[PDB]
Ligand binder design. Structure first.
Ligand SMILES: CCCCCCCCCCCCCCCCCC(=O)OC[C@H](COP(=O)([O-])OCC(O)COP(=O)([O-])OC[C@@H](COC(=O)CCCCCCCCCCCCCCCCC)OC(=O)CCCCCCCCCCCCCCCCC)OC(=O)CCCCCCCCCCCCCCCCC
Ligand SMILES: CCCCCCCCCCCCCCCCCC(=O)OC[C@H](COP(=O)([O-])OCC(O)COP(=O)([O-])OC[C@@H](COC(=O)CCCCCCCCCCCCCCCCC)OC(=O)CCCCCCCCCCCCCCCCC)OC(=O)CCCCCCCCCCCCCCCCC
Ligand SMILES: CCCCCCCCCCCCCCCCCC(=O)OC[C@H](COP(=O)([O-])OCC[N+](C)(C)C)OC(=O)CCCCCCCCCCCCCCCCC
Ligand SMILES: CCCCCCCCCCCCCCCCCC(=O)OC[C@H](COP(=O)([O-])OCC[N+](C)(C)C)OC(=O)CCCCCCCCCCCCCCCCC
Lengths: 460, 58, 482, 129, 53
């Protein structure tokens, strides 16, 4: 009004203004006249439906008024061939770039002004575009999530992605991050195919990530039968179903056309020994674990919780000083799995780093004490429930549970962890140890290590 | 959500900057009035207030 | 449910955004919370959330670094570590086993003027968390041998503070801001005094400060209000009551001392620069306005935001991010608002290449000062939406319990989501400008620059440029060069 | 992190040999070392010739003007073909006159008409009967 | 105007020189390689190819 205009022209407070009173109200007492409503939490209900095409929809009902979360999960790095290795990384580096309905700048502005967040994360055999925002901004945000998650890559997007992928590769090489070491581990484990393709993609194929290759990748892999849409905090399932239908209904059914299909993954017991002249030696010893289908997966997690929390610290890090750091790796895949240890320590005692490490893993095969098992299970429960308490992570794991087991199992994770016993963990680890080892070593004196046959004999 | 065009943001920013800079117009006017005051006096009483017509008898 | 569909945009009257005084429907509802006070002065707060899978119990004790002395410097760390060493009822093995059996998440953080012990557990043993946590903080026995044993750990922890460069720069900012008060001394204690703390000093510190009036126990998550209240009355109800006769050091106001410190350490490859204004206290009228300012001048990292995703930095609704996008080597920026009982510090921490030292030095000063004269509505609404999302996003039991305990400690009240939303939504361009000129325009500064200072050594004093940098568009000469 | 990029991004960084005298010991830097900074007008003025050109498999032959006619192809045909036809019908008319004969003719006619009207009115002013 | 000039210039310079300096003993593994390999001279172009060769 005129009074506000006058009091803004001269930067002087308007004492009588109600907004001034509200903003300058003493924090010790509530603002006069305002008293928000009170409400109690409600049990969460999960509902799953399928469209005429293969797209699936999952909703977690509102438990308490909060920001709505949405997401799209694509079963589509395992589905990358040497022709199009690293496409998913380029998509990640330019996940906000769309040109069909909304622009890169405009959808970034949508993210910024909605006050929420929008992220894209991809693993082997999965990509996930998640977003969280206020309810009244949900619709628009979803229009961005779907397009960014389903629109074919544009030439400008691919051009930007090539540069960003090159920068990412340079940064990874400069930092010597454990991700590159894991890439080498998977290369030797599976053999540059299926799960063996590097997560960040081959560096020699970066220049080939043109819009044509990305579009070929999307056409081959992205199909309605492998698209899951998820919402969390939605009062009505049907409202979100309609919201999705308004966007993903156009996608034609892929039935009747030869599908790409995923080749069954084979495990290879290779070894890699790289001389890097590093003052520290990094070793990794892995074996084939069980897939998601097998019930032993939980046990394996407990085994990891038995190492990364209680054992591996005391037996290796505390007793020996040359152990820079040791950890237990546990990856699960739809058709295979990996479980083992990754250690790093002084190069001059590389052999001492290896033997002891094996013993620790072998100790698990020997048996587990009751107290250690209880501690590991308690720590695993704490971590899992800390993850589940946050709505976004809960929704992501809900999507993954639906896409893997066709039902929701995160509601009874605690019971599954409780059901685990020491005997099951010991037997599972003993069975895993019998598999052909996959051994990787990068260090200054990796040239002097026990032979692969000696490694197997020690493991035996 | 509030998604104003960058045209509008540029226009509003430049409007504020113009408002800020206009405040020095009076300052320079006062400086050039204190200075050159005889010129202002000549202008005022030659154009806006012309002298009287008649002449002294002598 | 809610009237009409929840995704409705009907209320978005102001061109796709809510009006000034309105708040989102989600923030109109507040979770029940009850606060009670005991005879000892211990304050029990409970905000149950049945659906949550965990229960968090956070004990906040107002004892902290502020209540120490040069001769007793660092005793707070010793108390922190010795609480878990043993007690009359439980040994070190006993307490370690108890902690392992239940949730192993026991986060203990000691900061100036406060110490927080937050324990996260399963809902079915929340009482075990209370009775345990009430015992450990109350009946702990401090042996001379045990205190001697942990001197090495405390000393090493006082040397490794440089690993978290942001934390060390904040410590140095506190040092330079309050040069005539113990509030400026580091929270990790004086290195050379950390080998002089004995059993008697620790016992005196925990007898003078750990009193009922200084205890606030908050519970969040799947917790039964009545059961938790009864358990906490049983456990913390026997805490010794505060005695007015005892003397608590450093009780005067830490008056702000503007200064500029240059920790010149070449070979670092990067520069940490912190620039801070004096800020209101917890009880000041402009408490929520400064939080809104913090969310206006948000965090930044070169791996995110304009650093990696945009055609140009100008094509966005954030001026600070617009400036930071054009600086390739300025990697990290974060805005910190630290309110205390008497004073506060609001400022920016930059971490980036030293070639841009004069930019990071003069950037945060300019933007805030610019808001003293003109702030666009786009920035106001961006900060408002960010604040709403932050209010709705506090869903983890530990963090919410800690926030409840801190709010009860510093305000004797739990501030509901709806009230904060109403307070910050009412802010307008004029109110923002007036608050900024009250706190940012033509004001003094506390500056610290840690790292390569070859290009910053000249002009490394509080010269004309530093004082004129807090003027929007006046004194911005040095920022735009290079 | 203590790394140059702070552990978050890769910085395209370069230490220019400019403002340095010795690359090692007492040895001097190459005189034209600065020219190795590609894509900079400051490096060389030749960068101002920034036309777009890329080609492969192209071979060009140019002969010394010492083995060529001083005035090549001059009056190669008859005078009529080289001058009257090539120059006065394909270089002057086909290019110049054929493009402006109509507009210039219209403008000239209109200007002449109006100037004649102006002169007639002037005569009427000056002379009576 | 002389006294105000004095206040502006000489007292101000004396105030700016009220600096507290501190030097410590850094004995970490880091070597002072920046000192050994560093430095830029604005007149280096006048010294390159002319002096100390
Ligand atoms: C009504 C009835 C009418 C009846 C009559 C009708 C008549 C009709 C006539 C029609 C005429 C048609 C003309 C057609 C022209 C076509 C041209 C042509 O195609 O050119 C290419 C033609 C062919 O070359 P091409 O294309 O390589 O073809 C290869 C050929 O098959 C083979 O190539 P080539 O290499 O064998 O070429 C041979 C060519 C030459 O070709 C060459 O290789 C080039 C050689 C150039 C040499 C130039 C002269 C060098 C010396 C200069 C003076 C230095 C003085 C230094 C003093 C120092 C003192 C200290 O022959 C010559 O040697 C001729 C050069 C003549 C140069 C004259 C310049 C002026 C000299 C003045 C001297 C003054 C002295 C003063 C002393 C001191 C006084 C105090 O090349 C030439 O002709 C080059 C020479 C051109 C000379 C032009 C001179 C013009 C003079 C002015 C205009 C004339 C009127 C002036 C009136 C003045 C009144 C005051
Ligand atoms: C009163 C005193 C005297 C005053 C004199 C005033 C002169 C005014 C001239 C106005 C035009 C100047 C244009 C300059 C260039 C800009 C235009 C341009 O480039 O256009 C692109 C156009 C197309 O080029 P393009 O597509 O880029 O292709 C590249 C060309 O092939 C590239 O071309 P190119 O390199 O192959 O050709 C070079 C060019 C070289 O020409 C030049 O521009 C050189 C001029 C040198 C002398 C300039 C200064 C002279 C000053 C004398 C007075 C000095 C007084 C002050 C003295 C000191 C103080 C007292 O030679 C020609 O092409 C000549 C072709 C024209 C020959 C005549 C053919 C038509 C004959 C039948 C009509 C006769 C008149 C009809 C009147 C209306 C009724 C029908 O270029 C041309 O073809 C234009 C050529 C240049 C103009 C030719 C003459 C046109 C005159 C029309 C005047 C009509 C006025 C209204 C009626 C007046 C009634 C009295
Ligand atoms: C006919 C005139 C010819 C002779 C030249 C006259 C020159 C007079 C110079 C002295 C008076 C200047 C007064 C305005 C000062 C503005 C300063 C400024 O930066 O602007 C603030 C802000 C910008 O703030 P800023 O802080 O970004 O300023 C920097 C501006 N740049 C980047 C351009 C250097 O701009 C405005 O919003 C106001 C602009 C006012 C001037 C607009 C000029 C064009 C429109 C009006 C004139 C149109 C007719 C021109 C003649 C055409 C004839 C056919
Ligand atoms: C006949 C002669 C008549 C003379 C009458 C004189 C009466 C003067 C009375 C003045 C009363 C006080 C007014 C205070 C205004 C403060 C505004 C403000 O907040 O400023 C901040 C802003 C800029 O702010 P800022 O960015 O510099 O800093 C703000 C400060 N903080 C951050 C702390 C809040 O400046 C302006 O508003 C300036 C523009 C407004 C004034 C413009 C006047 C133009 C007049 C031109 C001369 C005309 C002469 C006549 C010509 C006739 C031709 C025929």
């Amino acid at each position: 009004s005129v009074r506000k205009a006058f009091y803004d022209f001269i930067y002087k407070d308007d004492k009588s203004a109600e907004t001034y009173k509200v903003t300058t109200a003493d924090p010790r007492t509530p603002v006069q006249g305002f008293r928000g409503q009170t409400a109690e939490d409600v049990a969460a209900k999960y509902e799953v439906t399928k469209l005429a095409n293969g797209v699936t929809i999952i909703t977690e009902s509102q438990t308490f008024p909060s920001q709505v979360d949405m997401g799209i999960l694509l079963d589509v790095t395992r589905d990358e061939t040497n022709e199009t290795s690293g496409s998913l990384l380029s998509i990640k580096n330019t996940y906000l770039k769309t040109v069909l309905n909304t622009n890169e700048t405009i959808n970034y502005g949508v993210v910024q002004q909605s006050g929420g967040s929008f992220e894209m994360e991809y693993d082997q055999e999965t990509a996930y575009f998640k977003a969280n925002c206020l309810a009244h901004d949900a619709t628009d945000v979803f229009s961005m999530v779907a397009d960014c998650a389903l629109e074919p890559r544009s030439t400008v997007a691919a051009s930007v992605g090539v540069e960003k992928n090159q920068n990412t590769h340079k940064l990874e090489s400069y930092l010597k991050t454990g991700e590159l070491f894991n890439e080498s581990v998977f290369k030797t484990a599976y053999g540059l195919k299926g799960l063996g393709l590097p997560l960040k993609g081959l560096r020699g194929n970066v220049k080939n990530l043109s819009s044509y290759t990305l579009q070929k990748f999307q056409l081959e892999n992205i199909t309605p039968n492998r698209i899951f849409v998820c919402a969390a905090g939605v009062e009505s399932h049907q409202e979100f179903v309609d919201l999705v239908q308004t966007k993903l209904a156009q996608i034609p059914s892929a039935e009747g056309q030869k599908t790409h299909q995923r080749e069954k993954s084979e495990y290879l017991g290779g070894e890699v020994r790289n001389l890097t002249e590093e003052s520290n030696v990094t070793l990794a010893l892995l074996f084939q674990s069980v897939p998601w289908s097998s019930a032993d997966i939980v046990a394996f997690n407990v085994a990891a919780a038995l190492l990364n929390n209680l054992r591996l610290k005391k037996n290796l890090l505390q007793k020996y000083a040359y152990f820079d750091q040791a950890e237990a790796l546990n990856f699960h895949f739809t058709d295979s799995g990996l479980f083992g240890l990754r250690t790093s320590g002084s190069a001059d005692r590389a052999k001492d780093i290896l033997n002891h490490s094996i013993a620790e893993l072998k100790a698990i095969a020997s048996g587990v004490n009751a107290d250690e098992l209880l501690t590991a299970k308690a720590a695993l429960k704490n971590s899992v429930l800390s993850a589940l308490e946050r709505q976004t992570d809960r929704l992501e794991e809900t999507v993954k549970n639906v896409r893997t087991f066709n039902k929701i199992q995160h509601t009874d994770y605690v019971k599954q962890i409780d059901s685990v016993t020491a005997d099951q963990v010991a037997k599972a680890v003993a069975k895993v140890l019998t598999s052909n080892p996959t051994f990787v070593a990068q260090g200054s004196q990796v040239n002097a290590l026990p032979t692969y046959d000696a490694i197997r004999n020690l493991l035996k | 959500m509030y998604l104003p065009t960058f045209y509008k943001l540029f226009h509003e920013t430049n409007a504020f900057r113009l408002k800020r800079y206009v405040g020095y117009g009076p300052l320079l006017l006062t400086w050039s009035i204190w200075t050159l005051y005889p010129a202002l006096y000549n202008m005022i009483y030659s154009d806006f207030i012309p002298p009287e017509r008649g002449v002294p008898k002598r | 449910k809610s009237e009409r569909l929840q995704f409705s945009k009907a209320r978005l009257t102001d061109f796709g955004e809510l009006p000034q005084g309105e708040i989102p429907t989600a923030l109109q509802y507040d979770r029940p919370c009850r606060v009670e006070t005991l005879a000892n002065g211990v304050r029990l707060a409970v905000e149950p959330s049945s659906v949550s899978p965990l229960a968090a119990v956070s004990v906040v004790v107002r004892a902290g670094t502020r209540q120490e002395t040069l001769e007793t410097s660092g005793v707070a760390q010793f108390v922190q570590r010795l609480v878990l060493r043993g007690t009359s009822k439980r040994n070190r093995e006993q307490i370690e086993k108890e902690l392992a059996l239940l949730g192993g998440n026991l986060k203990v953080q000691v900061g100036r003027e406060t110490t927080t012990y937050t324990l996260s557990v399963l809902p079915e043993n929340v009482e075990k968390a209370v009775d345990f946590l009430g015992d450990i903080l109350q009946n702990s026995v401090f042996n001379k041998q045990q205190v001697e044993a942990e001197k090495e750990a405390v000393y090493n922890n006082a040397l490794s503070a440089q690993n978290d460069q942001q934390g060390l720069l904040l410590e140095n900012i506190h040092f330079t801001a309050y040069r005539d008060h113990y509030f400026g001394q580091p929270t990790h204690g004086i290195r050379e005094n950390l080998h002089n703390i004995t059993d008697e000093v620790v016992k005196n510190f925990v007898k003078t400060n750990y009193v009922g009036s200084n205890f606030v126990v908050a519970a969040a998550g799947n917790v039964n209000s009545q059961a938790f209240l009864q358990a906490a009355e049983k456990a913390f109800g026997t805490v010794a009551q505060k005695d007015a006769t005892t003397f608590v050091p450093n009780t005067e106001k830490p008056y702000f001392t503007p200064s500029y410190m240059t920790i010149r350490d070449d070979e670092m490859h990067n520069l940490n620069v912190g620039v801070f204004f004096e800020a209101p206290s917890w009880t000041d009228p402009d408490f929520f306005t400064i939080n809104f300012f913090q969310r206006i001048l948000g965090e930044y990292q070169a791996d995110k935001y304009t650093g990696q995703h945009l055609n140009t930095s100008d094509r966005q609704y954030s001026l600070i991010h617009k400036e930071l996008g054009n600086l390739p080597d300025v990697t990290i920026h974060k805005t910190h608002y630290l309110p205390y009982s008497d004073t506060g510090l609001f400022g920016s921490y930059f971490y980036g290449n030293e070639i841009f030292g004069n930019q990071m030095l003069f950037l945060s000063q300019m933007i805030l000062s610019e808001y003293a004269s003109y702030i666009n509505q786009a920035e106001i609404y961006r900060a408002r939406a960010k604040y709403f999302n932050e209010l709705l996003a506090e869903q983890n039991s530990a963090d919410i319990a800690s926030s409840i305990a801190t709010q009860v400690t510093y305000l004797n009240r739990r501030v509901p989501r709806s009230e904060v939303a109403k307070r910050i939504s009412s802010l307008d361009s004029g109110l923002i400008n007036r608050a900024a000129t009250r706190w940012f325009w033509d004001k003094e500064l506390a500056i610290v620059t840690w790292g390569p200072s070859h290009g910053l050594i000249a002009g490394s004093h509080y010269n004309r440029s530093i004082k004129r940098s807090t003027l929007g568009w006046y004194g911005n000469t040095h920022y735009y060069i290079v | 992190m203590n790394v140059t990029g702070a552990g978050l991004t890769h910085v395209k960084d370069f230490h220019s040999d400019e403002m340095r005298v010795f690359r090692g010991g007492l040895r001097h830097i190459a005189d034209k070392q600065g020219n190795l900074i590609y894509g900079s007008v400051n490096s060389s003025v030749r960068y101002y010739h920034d036309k777009m050109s890329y080609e492969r498999g192209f071979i060009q032959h140019s002969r010394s003007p010492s083995n060529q006619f001083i005035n090549f192809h001059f009056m190669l045909g008859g005078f009529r073909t080289y001058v009257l036809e090539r120059f006065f019908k394909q270089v002057w008319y086909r290019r110049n006159i054929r493009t402006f004969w109509f507009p210039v003719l219209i403008s000239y006619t209109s200007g002449c008409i109006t100037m004649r009207m102006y002169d007639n009115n002037c005569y009427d002013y000056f002379y009576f009967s | 105007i002389l006294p105000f000039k004095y206040f502006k210039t000489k007292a101000y310079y004396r105030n700016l020189l009220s600096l507290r300096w501190e030097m410590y003993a850094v004995r970490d593994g880091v070597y002072y390689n920046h000192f050994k390999y560093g430095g830029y001279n604005s007149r280096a172009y006048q010294f390159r190819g002319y002096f100390w060769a």
